[PDB]
Amino acid sequence: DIMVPSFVYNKLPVIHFLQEKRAEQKLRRVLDETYTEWTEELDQAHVTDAITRSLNI
Amino acid sequence: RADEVDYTNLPAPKPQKTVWDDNIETEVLRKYLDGLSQYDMEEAKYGV
Known part of the structure; x- marks a missing residue:
């Protein structure tokens, strides 16, 4: 009733x-x-270069 | 009667790097167009 409640309050x-x-x-x-x-x-x-190569240019 | 000419001498074909118009389509393609120009110069130097 007294002791533990007080120490819980302190915590x-x-x-x-x-x-x-x-x-x-x-x-x-x-x-x-x-x-x-x-x-x-x-x-x-690189896509544009492969496109050109495929054209045989 | 001195030397006349070296018939076995050919003036090398002076190459010219192709120049592309400066637009957005050139900025986007800059690397590809530069590669084409390099290939053209190599072909001109070697012959085909």
Whole structure:
């Protein structure tokens, strides 16, 4: 009725602070894993060159 | 009566690099057109 309740009350602020940091840590890691991915596609000039060769030019 | 001419001498065929008009169709094709010009110059130098 008295003792355990008081010590639970004492624990609340630190646990709240640590869990807020843990949540921020998760969000930070989520952002850090994001990285714009640029793709490379076959240049059309080689297509235009193969087109020309096929013509027997 | 001195030397007249070296009949076995031929003036080499002076090649000229083809120049393409500067449009968007040339900028898009720049590499391909440059390759064609290089091939033309090689053909002119070697003969065919």
